[PDB]
C-alpha cells in the first residue's frame, strides 16, 4: 500500500502539456522522502507546504499532474505566471499549495531528426482557469469569418509539435514535470505519510 509515485515519475511515456495526465493517489502510504532526497530533479519547489511536513499529514486525495514542456517554459509552471503554457496549456492557481518537480528528459524525449510527438496549444479564445484541461482540436477562428472546421486564411489548427532534437540548446530540450496537489474533502483522509 505504498503510494504508486513510481507509475507517474518513471512512466516510459509522458503526456503532451495540452493533454496533461492526472493520477489520483488515494488509500496509501506516501513516502515523500523518495522524492525530496532524490538527486534526479533540477526543479523541486513547494508553495506553502514542506515535503518533510507532508510525512506528518493525511489527505483525502493527492493528485500528480504530469507532462512535457521545453526547458525555458518550466518557469511558467508556477503561480502568477503568463505565457503560452500558463495561458493555454496548464495553469496553477495564484494561491497554489503543492509542489512543482521537473527534470531534463533529453535522453528519453529527443531523437535524431526530431521527436514531434509532444504538442502544445498555440491558440485559444481565452486563458485557462486553474487546473483546466482543453484537448479540443477545433479550428481556431482568428478573424470574423467562421471556419466551419476548414483550415485556411485566419483559420488555424490550434496545436503544434515541439521539435525535440538531442542537439537542441538546454532551453529547447524536453523537461518532464510533475505537479503535486493536496485535497481535503468531507471524506476519510486515506493518503498519509509513513508516520
Amino acid at each position: 500500500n505504498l503510494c504508486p509515485f513510481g507509475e507517474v515519475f518513471n512512466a516510459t511515456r509522458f503526456a503532451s502539456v495540452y493533454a496533461w495526465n492526472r493520477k489520483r493517489i488515494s488509500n496509501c502510504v506516501a513516502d515523500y522522502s523518495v522524492l525530496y532526497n532524490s538527486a534526479s530533479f533540477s526543479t523541486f519547489k513547494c508553495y506553502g507546504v514542506s515535503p518533510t511536513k507532508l510525512n506528518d499529514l493525511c489527505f483525502t486525495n493527492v493528485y500528480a499532474d504530469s507532462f512535457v514542456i521545453r526547458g525555458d517554459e518550466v518557469r511558467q509552471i508556477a503561480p502568477g505566471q503568463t505565457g503560452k503554457i500558463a495561458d493555454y496549456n496548464y495553469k496553477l492557481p495564484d494561491d497554489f499549495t503543492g509542489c512543482v518537480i521537473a527534470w531534463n528528459s533529453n535522453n528519453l524525449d529527443s531523437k535524431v531528426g526530431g521527436n514531434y510527438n509532444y504538442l502544445y496549444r498555440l491558440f485559444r479564445k481565452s486563458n485557462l482557469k486553474p487546473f483546466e484541461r482543453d484537448i479540443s482540436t477545433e479550428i481556431y477562428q482568428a478573424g470574423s469569418t467562421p471556419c466551419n472546421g476548414v483550415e485556411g486564411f485566419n483559420c488555424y489548427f490550434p496545436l503544434q509539435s515541439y521539435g525535440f532534437q538531442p542537439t537542441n540548446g538546454v532551453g529547447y530540450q524536453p523537461y518532464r514535470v510533475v505537479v503535486l496537489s493536496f485535497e481535503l474533502l468531507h471524506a476519510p483522509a486515506t493518503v498519509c505519510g509513513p508516520k
Partner: nanobody
Amino acid sequence: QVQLVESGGGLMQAGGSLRLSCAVSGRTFSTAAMGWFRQAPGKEREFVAAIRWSGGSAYYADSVKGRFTISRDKAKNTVYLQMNSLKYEDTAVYYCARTENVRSLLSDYATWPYDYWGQGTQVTVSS
C-alpha cells in the same frame, strides 16, 4: 519500421481520372499529415497536395487545384489522390510522404520536410 506503399499508377488517356492509394503500416498515432509529390524524368520533385491527418483539411499546389483531390481513411491508414482531368503534363512518378510534425499553419506542409517516403507509382497520360 514505418512503411509507405503507393499503388494505382498506370497508363491513362488524357481527360480521364485515376485514384492513387498510399497505405501506411507500423506507427499510426503519431501521423500529423500525408502529402503527395511527383517527379518527371530530369525535373525536380514537386509538391502536389497535403492533408492534415486529424481533421482532414487539404492544401493543394496551384497546378492541380480544381482537378486533384486528396482524401484519407484513418481506419485503413490510407491516403488517396483522385487525379481528375488528366493532362500529358501530369505524367510523373507520384510519391506519398508522411510527417509526424504537427504544424498550426496547414501551408507549412507545402515546404516543410517529410521524414518518410514511399517508392513511388508511375502515372503516364497519353491521348
